[PDB]
Each structure stands twice: as structure tokens, then as C-alpha cells.
Design a protein around this ligand. Structure first.
Ligand SMILES: O=C(O)C[C@H](Cc1ccccc1)C(=O)O
Ligand SMILES: [Ca+2]
Ligand SMILES: [Ca+2]
Ligand SMILES: [Ca+2]
Ligand SMILES: [Ca+2]
Ligand SMILES: [Zn+2]
Length: 316
């Protein structure tokens, strides 16, 4: 759309009020011209055809309950874009300011969200297992990072490379959640999962086993479900990443934490410089070590912690 940039106001999935960037041209659209080539949010109107209609609103106020998921998908995509730009100096997912598109109200009672190779898509949830998925900043950032991976390492979505692809998305989704300071934690999807149950989440990076995911290589899933356990075996990497950041002793191996910022720098470097589409866990470890070496020196503590952390999860 061609029009005038403006700012609107609405309420998100969790009921919080926020301002969002809109464009005015007869209607007010969810089109943010302030970031790269724009962020665009569409209404899929409970259908599965994509992307749907660019979101249009008459008065620039988005307080209807039907509006909530659009408000958050639109807002959280801006935050994520900011994180990448500010923190890693990367312009959008392609590094060249590509437009960011998302659709909401995808299908009926759809308990999922995803990156389809061109855009983000969010279901509204069935109201029991999930509420609308774009209400979780870690979910939004998890999706946008899959775009980042597609344009960089290109990790194939299956088996080990696939689990790495998933872990990357959880790690950066969590780093973004801390960046925005939105009640941050090392859990995944807590804000939109099982509205009826407090305290849980979809996955845990601090203790993957809490939800039955592996936290050691010896416990990896080797069957065929889930594309070869991409959402299961990611726990091994997630745990490694949590250890690098926070420190701890796991299976008798002690890791000194080096903090979130360094975690993010090391992983981003590995992702953008060293990983390839078919990289496996063992290659990820070599990548992460090389990255930390590049950044901090081979005799650094940073390098030492990366090694310890992988040793702790059994990745050699
Ligand atoms: O892999 C994906 O992008 C799909 C999905 C995303 C998701 C993340 C966090 C919470 C809910 C949903 C998953 O099942 O992880
Ligand atoms: Ca309105
Ligand atoms: Ca949180
Ligand atoms: Ca979280
Ligand atoms: Ca819950
Ligand atoms: Zn994912």
C-alpha cells in the first residue's frame, strides 16, 4: 500500500496495550514502513489460503478481540527486527531488509505457527492447548529465526541438522524475549500454552527433560517421527546453550556461564559463517568452538565454556 505512516494503538492477546506502526490510505493498514522494506500483517480469515488480506482497520484503534493476534504478530515482528539489527547488525532475515510478512487467524483451532519459506503463519489455538500463537514473543522470534536460518546456514529440516535448526530458533527466540525484557525465561511458549495451567510451557531449555525431551546425546531419539525428532533432539542443543550462558553442573560436568550476550554472538557467528545445510551436532560443536575462538581467543574462558557445555551434553 502507498500512504502515510502513522501510529495506532491496540491490545494484544494477553490484554496488554501497545502502540503499533500503521499506514494510512482510506483505511489504516498493519503496514510498518519504519523497518527495512516494511512489516505487513494479514488476515487469513480462518482459511488456509495465504497470505490473505492485508490488515485494514477503519479507525487506527485495535481493541477488538479479533484484532489481538494481529496486533501482537505485527508488534513482535518489529521487536525481532530490531533485535537483529541492533544486536547483530543484520537487516531483516535476508540481510538485505526483505519485507516481513505474517498472517494471523490461519485455519480454525489451529494449534501451531510456522515459517513457510516465504512468510510467518499463526493459528489461533483451540483455546485449550493454546491461545493465539502470536501472543508469545519467543514464538514470533522462533519463527523469524527460521527465516534467518533459511538464508544463511540453510539447515535441512530433518535429523540432526533439523534439530539444530530448531534449537537455533529456540535460542534466538529466548534471546529476543530477554532483549524485550518481557518477563524473560528459558522456557519456550509459556505465554500461549495451556491457558488453564500455570507454570508450564512447550519446551524447556533449562531442563528439557522436564517435558520428556533429551538433555544428553546418549538419550537422543533415533526414530522417524517429527522429521526424525527435530523438536525432540533440539533439547540436547538447547541445554548446551543454556549451560554456556548460565553455567551449571550437568551429568557431573561443570560449566562456567559466560552470559547471554556472548552466547548470542557465538551462535550467530556459527550460524552465519560456519554451519552448512547438512551440519550435524558434532559439526555444530566445531563451529561454536571456532566462533568463540575467532571472537575471544583460543585460550579464552569463552572457548573453554563452549567445550565444557558440549562435553556436558555428550556432544563430541
Ligand atoms: O517449529 C515450528 O516453528 C513450529 C512450532 C512453533 C512453536 C514454537 C513455540 C511454541 C509454539 C509453537 C513448534 O512446535 O515448536
Ligand atoms: Ca478499529
Ligand atoms: Ca516469558
Ligand atoms: Ca519464554
Ligand atoms: Ca500454561
Ligand atoms: Zn521451529
Amino acid at each position: 500500500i502507498t500512504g502515510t505512516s502513522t501510529v495506532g494503538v491496540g491490545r494484544g492477546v494477553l490484554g496488554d496495550q501497545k502502540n503499533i506502526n500503521t499506514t494510512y490510505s482510506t483505511y489504516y493498514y498493519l503496514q510498518d514502513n519504519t523497518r527495512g522494506d516494511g512489516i505487513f500483517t494479514y488476515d487469513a480469515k480462518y482459511r488456509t489460503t495465504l497470505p490473505g488480506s492485508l490488515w485494514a482497520d477503519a479507525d487506527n484503534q485495535f481493541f477488538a478481540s479479533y484484532d489481538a493476534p494481529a496486533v501482537d504478530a505485527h508488534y513482535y515482528a518489529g521487536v525481532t527486527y530490531d533485535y537483529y539489527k541492533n544486536v547483530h547488525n543484520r537487516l531483516s532475515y535476508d540481510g538485505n531488509n526483505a519485507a516481513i510478512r505474517s498472517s494471523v487467524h490461519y485455519s480454525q483451532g489451529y494449534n501451531n505457527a510456522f515459517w513457510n519459506g516465504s512468510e510467518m503463519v499463526y493459528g489461533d489455538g483451540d483455546g485449550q492447548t493454546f491461545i493465539p500463537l502470536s501472543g508469545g514473543i519467543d514464538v514470533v522470534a522462533h519463527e523469524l529465526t527460521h527465516a534467518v536460518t533459511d538464508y544463511t546456514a540453510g539447515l535441512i529440516y530433518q535429523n540432526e541438522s533439523g534439530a539444530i535448526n530448531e534449537a537455533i530458533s529456540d535460542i534466538f527466540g529466548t534471546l529476543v524475549e530477554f532483549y524485550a525484557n518481557k518477563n524473560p525465561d528459558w522456557e519456550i511458549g509459556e505465554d500461549v500454552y495451556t491457558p488453564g495451567i500455570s507454570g508450564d510451557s512447550l519446551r524447556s531449555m533449562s531442563d528439557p527433560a522436564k517435558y520428556g525431551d533429551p538433555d544428553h546425546y546418549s538419550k537422543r531419539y533415533t526414530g522417524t517421527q517429527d522429521n526424525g525428532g527435530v523438536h525432540i533432539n533440539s533439547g540436547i542443543i538447547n541445554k548446551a546453550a543454556y549451560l554456556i550462558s548460565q553455567g551449571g553442573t550437568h551429568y557431573g560436568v561443570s560449566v562456567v556461564g559466560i552470559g547471554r550476550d556472548k552466547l548470542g554472538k557465538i551462535f550467530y557467528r556459527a550460524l552465519t559463517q560456519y554451519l552448512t545445510p547438512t551440519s550435524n551436532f558434532s559439526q555444530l560443536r566445531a563451529a561454536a568452538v571456532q566462533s568463540a575462538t575467532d571472537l575471544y581467543g583460543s585460550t579464552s574462558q569463552e572457548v573453554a565454556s563452549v567445550k565444557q557445555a558440549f562435553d556436558a551434553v555428550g556432544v563430541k
